[PDB]
Amino acid sequence: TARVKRGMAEMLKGGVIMDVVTPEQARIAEGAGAVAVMALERVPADIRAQGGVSRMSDPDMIEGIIAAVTIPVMAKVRIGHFVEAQILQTLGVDYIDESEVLTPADYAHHIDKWNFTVPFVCGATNLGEALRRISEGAAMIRSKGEAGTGDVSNATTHMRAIGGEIRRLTSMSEDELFVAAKELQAPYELVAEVARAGKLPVTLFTAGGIATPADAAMMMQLGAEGVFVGSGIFKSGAPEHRAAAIVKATTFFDDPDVLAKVSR
Amino acid sequence: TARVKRGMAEMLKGGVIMDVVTPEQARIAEGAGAVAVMALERVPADIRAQGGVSRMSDPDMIEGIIAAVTIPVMAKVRIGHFVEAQILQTLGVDYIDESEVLTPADYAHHIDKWNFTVPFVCGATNLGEALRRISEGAAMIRSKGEAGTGDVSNATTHMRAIGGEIRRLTSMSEDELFVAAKELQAPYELVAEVARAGKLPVTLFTAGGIATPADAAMMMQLGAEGVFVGSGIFKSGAPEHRAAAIVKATTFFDDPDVLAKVSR
Amino acid sequence: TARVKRGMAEMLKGGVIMDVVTPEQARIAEGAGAVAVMALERVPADIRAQGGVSRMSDPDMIEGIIAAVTIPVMAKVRIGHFVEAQILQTLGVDYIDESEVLTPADYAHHIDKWNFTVPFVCGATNLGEALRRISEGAAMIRSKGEAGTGDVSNATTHMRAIGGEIRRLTSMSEDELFVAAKELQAPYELVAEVARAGKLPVTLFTAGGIATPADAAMMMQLGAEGVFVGSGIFKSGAPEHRAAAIVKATTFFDDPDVLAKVSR
Amino acid sequence: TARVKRGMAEMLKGGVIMDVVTPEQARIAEGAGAVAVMALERVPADIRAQGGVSRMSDPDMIEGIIAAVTIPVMAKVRIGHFVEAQILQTLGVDYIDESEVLTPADYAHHIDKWNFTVPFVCGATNLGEALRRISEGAAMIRSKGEAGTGDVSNATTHMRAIGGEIRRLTSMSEDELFVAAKELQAPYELVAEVARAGKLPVTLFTAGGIATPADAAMMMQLGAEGVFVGSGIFKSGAPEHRAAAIVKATTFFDDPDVLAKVSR
Amino acid sequence: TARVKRGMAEMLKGGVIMDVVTPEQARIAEGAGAVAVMALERVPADIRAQGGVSRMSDPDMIEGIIAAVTIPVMAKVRIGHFVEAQILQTLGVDYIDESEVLTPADYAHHIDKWNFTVPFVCGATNLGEALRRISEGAAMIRSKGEAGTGDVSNATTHMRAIGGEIRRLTSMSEDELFVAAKELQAPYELVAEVARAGKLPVTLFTAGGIATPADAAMMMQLGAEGVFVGSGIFKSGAPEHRAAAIVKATTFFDDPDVLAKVSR
Amino acid sequence: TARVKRGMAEMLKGGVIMDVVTPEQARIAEGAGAVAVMALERVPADIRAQGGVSRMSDPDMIEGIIAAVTIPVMAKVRIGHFVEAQILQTLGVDYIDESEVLTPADYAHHIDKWNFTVPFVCGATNLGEALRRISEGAAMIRSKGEAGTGDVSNATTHMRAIGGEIRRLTSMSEDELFVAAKELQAPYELVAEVARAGKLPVTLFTAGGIATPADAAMMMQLGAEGVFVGSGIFKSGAPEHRAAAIVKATTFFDDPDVLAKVSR
C-alpha cells in the first residue's frame, strides 16, 4: 500500500463545514449541527469583488473562533505557503485548508504536507489533481467549485469528473492502468489503489458554489462525503434557519420530503 | 416500438401557458383562458436584465400559485438539477420545465427524467436535440426561441428546423435512416419512428419571444400544438385584455378576421 | 429490449475462420478443424499490392467451395452493395461479410442488413462503429485489423478500443449514458444494453494481421471470441500443419506449453 | 579564481533592510533592529499607482537619512545611470541599488560597477541574470519579486529559480558545464565556481512583495540570507511593532512559536 | 520502498551482451568473454533495410542457442506482445527483451511484466521512460540508441539524458520532487527513490549503435553498467578478435593503453 | 587573466597542413614543405560522397603515418568522443582535431579538452563559437569552411565573421562588453581579452574548401595564420607539384608574382 494520510476526517463525514468570520457566526454554525467551522477574516464573495492579496487570517481572529466552539476549526493558507502552515499548526487548528481561494504564494509547488502533524484539506477539479494532492500528504480532498458565486455548476463538473474517473479505473483492464496513471499525471501506486478499491484514498467533500439545500443534497447524491458552505448562509437574514436547513439536507440528502420541508 | 413518455399533455394542446410571478397574475391567466401557468419568482426579461444565479423558485411561492388556480401549474428547474426536480415532484406541480432560462447546474448532462413520475417539458432548437431530450424521458418539447426578448425570429428558426427535419425523414429512403440518426446525433429507434409517423413522439409547443397575437398564431401555423408566453403580458397595462388576446389568437390561429380583431 | 440479430454464430465461437481460394484449401482448412471458411477469388495481400477494383467473387468459385466442405462458408460483398448480397444469399452462403477489404460500392451507407435472412459479419475499429453495424442488422462483428500485412498491431488497437469502451460503460453512472451514446454516435438503446450486460450484443471476433499462433492467442486473451485468418496459412510450407497450429493456439489460448509447441 | 566583489555585505547577513522616506522612519527602522535602511523619496507602491519618471532621490533627502542613523544607508539609481551612481558615491551611501523599481536610463546596458568603490546591489529573477550582474561588479544580489504589491509569489519564484539552478549545477557532470554556461547566458568561470561551491559568489537577499512576518521567514527558509522590506511597514498602525515583528521573524525564521506570536 | 524487480542482473554487470544468429556465433561470443547472448533470427541492420514485420524468433532457433552455451541467453518480443513473452518464458530464456527493434504489437501499452517470473529488459531514451518501464516490472533498462546503424550518438544522448536527470533529482529541493514526478510523467515513489539513492532502481546498460571498443568504453564512462552489441561484430572478418576487443574495452573502460591496444 | 592553452602551435604558423591517407602521401607532403600532416583513412570528398558513419582512424594506420615523417602528425576524433581522444593521446599524435567532418558522437557537448595533455584543434564559423571551443581547452581554432567541396566561399565568410567581430570588440565602449559577451554566447573573460588584445587567444587557421594557390593566399590575407588542405592535392596527377604550389602560396601570400608563377 501507498503512503497516504488515511482516516483523518471520519468525524466530519456526512457533515457540513461552514465558513465563519465571528465567534457569533461560529456558535450559530455549531447550534445548526455543523461538523466543523472554517475560520476566516475575509469572505470568498468579498475576495472576488474587493481583491487585495488574500493571506492567512490573523491568529487572534482564529483563536477567537477556536474559543467559541467545541467542534473542529479549520483555517486557510495560501498555496505553497508552508510558513503560514507552520504558524497555523502551532495555533492548534484541527485542519489546514491549502486554499486556492487565497492568493497563491507559490505558482508551481504546493506545500509538502508530510512535514506536518496537522491534516490538510486540498482542492481538486479532477481525479489526477486529487491524487497529486494526496501524494503530497493531503488528508482530505474537496472540489474547487467556483468560490463565492452561489453557482453549483462547477462543483457538479468537478464531482462528476472525479467520480467518473474513479468508476472508469475500477472496470479498466489492469494492464492499461500504467498508461492511465501517465494520462492522469498521477502516481501509479495511487491509481492502482483507486482501481482496486473504487474509492479515493481519503474522504472527498464538495465545496464552491453550494447555495441551497437542493445543491448540497445534489452534491451528496453525486458521491460527496460532506459539504463546505460559505458565509452567505449568515448574510441572508434567518441565519439559524438557513444553516440548519443545509445541515438537514446533507444528512437526509436522499429524502425528497425532507428537502421540500427544509427548502420552505 | 421505442420508450417514450407519450400522451402526457393532451389537455394542454391548443392552449397558452403563461408565466406568473403572483397568485393575482395566476388568476388573470386562468380568467383569460390559459391552459396552465408557469410559476416563477423572477422573469426571463429580469434574468436577462440583471443576471446572478437563477434557480428553482421558493417552494412556498409555487404552492401559492397552485392554491390560486384550478388549471395545471408548471415550474422550472436548472438543467441537470435532479434534486430541484425531486423537490418539485413532492410539491405536486403538474409538469417540470427543465429550463435553459435558469442557470444550468450541469453543463454536460440533463436530468434522467425516467426517475420521475411527474412529466417534464424540455427545450430544443433542432430535431436531434428534441429526440435526445425525449430519449432522456421528456414528455413535451418546446422551442427555446430567445427567452424574454419579444423577438419571434429564433422561435421561427426552431420550428422550421424541427418541422423541416421531420419532413425530410418522412420521405427519406429507409436504408439512409441509419446515417441520418448518426448525423442527427439521435437514437435510431426514435429517428425511424419519426420517419414512419411524420410526427415528433411527444407534443411540440413554441416558446421564446412570442410577443403579439400574430406571433402566436404564426407559430401555430408553423406546426406548434400550443404556446408559452412570458409575464410581459401582465407588465403591459390592461393585462386581462393582452392575456385574452393571445389565447384567442392561439385557438383561432387560422382565422385572419379574429386575429385582426384581437390585435386592435 | 433492443432489435439485434442475436445468437447466429454460436457454432463458430472459439474457432478459426480461414480464407480459401480453391476447393483444396477449403479441404485443408476443414481437416485442420476450422469452424468456417471465407471463400474468395483474390487475397487481401494481392488487393493491397496490385491495383484495380475488388468485388464479390464469381458465384461459380463460391459454389465450388460450398461443394467441397461441410462447415459453413462465408463470402464477401462490397460495402453498401446490397445486390451483391442478394446474389450471395441465393447461393446459400452461410454468412455474408460486408467487407472493407473490397472496394466500397457506397461511401456513405452500409447495406440495410434487416432485408436479408442470411446473417452478416461487419468490421469495426471501436465500439460506436460496432454498435452502428449491429443497429443495421449485423449478426457478428469482427475487428478490421490491418488486412494482408501480417502486423497484428491494428487488431490489438481495435480489440482494446472495443473492449475498453464496453468496460467503461459497465461502471458509468447511469445518468451519463445518454451523453455517452451521443459521443459514441451509437443508439442509446444498444449503449444501455452494453452498459448492463458487459458484452457486445453479438459475437466479437478478431481479424486483420493475425500471422502467428501467438497473435491468435493474444487476440483471444484480449476478449476475441474467435479469429479470422488469411490464406498466407496456405502460402507457406506445410499448410496442413500451419492451419492446425492456429486452430490449436486459438483453442488453447491460455496454455503457454501448447502455444510454445505450435510456434515451432 | 573569478573576478567578483566578494564579502561586502557580511554585516547585513541575517537582517532586514527597510525602505525609509523620512528621518523619523529611519529612526524607527534602526530602533527595530534593521541592519540597513534604503533611503527613497517616493515608494514602489506610489510609483506603481501614479505615472511619471522615477529617478535617484534628491541628495538632501538622502543626506537627511544618513545623518539620522548609525546603520548603513543604501539608495537607488536607475539602471544604466552611471552618473546618478557617481553622485551617490560622493554622498557617502554605503550601498547603491541599481534598481528596476526606478525608470531605466539605459534599456540595453547596466552600469559597469567595477568603476566604483561603493558596492552595488542588483536584482535577478534567475541564476543567469544574477551571474551577469555579478560579472558587471555587483556585490550583492536580491530577487526582483514584484515590488509594492505585497504579493510574495514572484519572490517565491525567483528564490526557487536561483536556488534550483545552483543545486542543478552542483550535481551536473563537469563536462556539461560549458553548455550550461551557454544556456544560462552567464560567464563560464562564474558558472563553474557556483557548481563547485554550491553558493552564489555574493550574498543573496529577497526583495519584492514581502508583506508579513510569515513571508519573510518563508524566504529565509528558501535560502535568502536577508530580506528587503517596503515602507508599508510604516504606513500601517504601530510602526515600531510591525518593524520589530519582521526583524524577529527574519532572525528566528525556523521557530514557529516565535513566528506565531509576531503574526498577531 | 516502491515495488521494483531488484538485483536480477548482478552477474551481467561489467559485461557485454552480444546478438547471435547461430550456435557458432554463440560459441564465439562465449569464448570472447560475453556475459550473455541475445538469440535472434534476423539482425537490426537487416530489419532496417529488408523491413517485413519482425516478431519473436522461432523457438527451435532460440533452443539451438541455449544448447550451445552456458552463459545466459536473452531473446526479444514485440512491445506489448505478452503472448510471445508467455512462450519465451516456457522455453527457459534467462531474460526477455521487450524490444523496439521488433514491430510493436501494441502502440499504446507495454507488457505487464509483473505477470512473469522471467526478468525483462526494456529500452529508454530518458529517465521518465525508464521509470515507467520499471513501474511495469522491468528488471533492467537499456538505452535505445539507434539500432543497427553503428552510430553511437543517439546512445550518447540517451545515456546523458538518463544520467543527467538522475543527477538533477539528487540535488533537488525535496519539496519540488512532486512536480518533478509530474514533469517526468513517472511515479513519485520511484522519482523519490532515485533522488535519495542517486541511482536507477535497476541496472542500466547501453545499446544501439556501439560499433567500436572506443564506443563501448565511452558508454561505460557515461555511467553504463554494461553494453549490448549487434551481430556486425561477426559479419566483419576476425570475429574472435573483434568480440574479444569489445569485452576488454568494457571491462577496462578507464584504461587508455588497454583501449589503444585492443583498437589495433 | 583567463584560462587558455596558449602558444601550442607556434611551429605551425605560416604553414600548410595536409590530409594524407598513406605513408607515401605523407612523404610527398613533407617533401613539399608541409608543416604537419593530418592522418585519415577516408577523405572529406569520399565522406561527403559515400556517407555511413565516419570515426577515428585505425590506430595502426595513424602510427604508419607517424613512422613515415619527421613533421608533426594530427588525427581526427568525432565531436564529443572523449574516448577516441584518450586513445589518440596514447598514440603520441601531436594534435587532435575534434572534427565536424566526422560523424558527431555527442550532439550537445564537445570534449572537455582540459582533461588532456595533447593540444586540440577545433572548428568555428564565428567568434562566439571560437571562444566557446577555447573555453573548453582548444589550443588552435580553424574555420569549418565547407569540407571537401573546393568552394572557398564558406571559409571566406568564416574568416571575415571571426576577424570582423574581433575588430568590433577592439573599438567597443568597455561598458558594452558585458552585453557583447551575452550576444556572442561566450565567456566575458575571453571577450574582454579579445577586446584588449585585438587577437584570438590562440592561433587561427583556415580550412574547408581551399582548392588553389590563390585560395590559400586569400585566406592568409584575411588573417589566417596557416591553412589546412585536403588530399585533393594528391588526387590531381603531379602531386609533388600541386602540394609545393600551395605551400609556396601560403609562405609568399603577399607576393602576386610568386602566386602567378605557382598557379601556372
From Swiss-Prot, chains A, B, C, D, E, F:
Its EC number(s): 4.3.3.6
Covalent S-S links between cysteines: none
GO molecular function annotations of the record: pyridoxal 5'-phosphate synthase (glutamine hydrolysing) activity
Catalytic activities: aldehydo-D-ribose 5-phosphate + D-glyceraldehyde 3-phosphate + L-glutamine = pyridoxal 5'-phosphate + L-glutamate + phosphate + 3 H2O + H(+)
Catalytic-site annotation from UniProt: 76
Residues reported to bind D-ribose 5-phosphate: 19, 148, 209, 230-231
Binding site for D-glyceraldehyde 3-phosphate: 160
Domain of life, source organism: Bacteria
GO terms classed as biological process: amino acid metabolic process; pyridoxal phosphate biosynthetic process; pyridoxine biosynthetic process
Pathway per the UniProt entry: Cofactor biosynthesis; pyridoxal 5'-phosphate biosynthesis
Key words of the record: Lyase, Pyridoxal phosphate, Schiff base
PANTHER family given in the database record: PYRIDOXAL 5'-PHOSPHATE SYNTHASE SUBUNIT SNZ1-RELATED
UniProt function note: Catalyzes the formation of pyridoxal 5'-phosphate from ribose 5-phosphate (RBP), glyceraldehyde 3-phosphate (G3P) and ammonia. The ammonia is provided by the PdxT subunit. Can also use ribulose 5-phosphate and dihydroxyacetone phosphate as substrates, resulting from enzyme-catalyzed isomerization of RBP and G3P, respectively.
HAMAP family noted in UniProt: PdxS
Subunit structure: In the presence of PdxT, forms a dodecamer of heterodimers.
Similarity comment: Belongs to the PdxS/SNZ family.
Protein name (Swiss-Prot/TrEMBL): Pyridoxal 5'-phosphate synthase subunit PdxS
Native organism: Mycobacterium tuberculosis (strain CDC 1551 / Oshkosh)
Species lineage: Bacteria, Bacillati, Actinomycetota, Actinomycetes, Mycobacteriales
Gene name, Swiss-Prot/TrEMBL: pdxS
